Amino acid sequence: QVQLQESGGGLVQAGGSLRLSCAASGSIFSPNTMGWFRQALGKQREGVAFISSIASTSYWLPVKGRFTITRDNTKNTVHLQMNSLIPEDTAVYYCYAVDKSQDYWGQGTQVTVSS
């Protein structure tokens, strides 16, 4: 079984900063391609960004500088840095591990920003 521990969300004022994070525990393999998915309220889900095992990054949005991904190879976890928040990014985040055989999903974190 695979468990994706997500943390770091909540209520933050506009222009604030925070640290989303998830740890992948259980039966993972070797390619281990990971990333994030955003779900707006009552809307479709889109891919935020993606990080592979070779430190290659692929952002699926014009969000460079805003979002930055850090890797923990020793424990193999993914951190995402929220800075300079705007209300347009108020959506729930689930990180995604497509991996090699069976892809998995997180349970959810509420990130909210309003003024």
Next chain:
Amino acid sequence: NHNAQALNTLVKQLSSKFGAISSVLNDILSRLDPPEAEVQIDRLITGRL
């Protein structure tokens, strides 16, 4: 004359459809999909043999 006519007929036989949809191997290969193309090519081979 017998030699020349036999050779000419053998060469001319390549232009027949033999029940397929076309007499050009490349045309039938490009136009259709591997199963039906295989069927048509089988027809062409069994005629030319």
Next chain:
Amino acid sequence: PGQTGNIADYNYKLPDDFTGCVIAWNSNKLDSKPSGNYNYLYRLFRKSK
């Protein structure tokens, strides 16, 4: 085997001589959601077959 399509081209290919068989069944009850089940993704761009 030998069927042309986007999913066949870029997601799953079956050999022309494939042996065995496929089974498919509807999954509205489980694999569908009123808000939309989208956990399943398909590749629609790819350079080569």
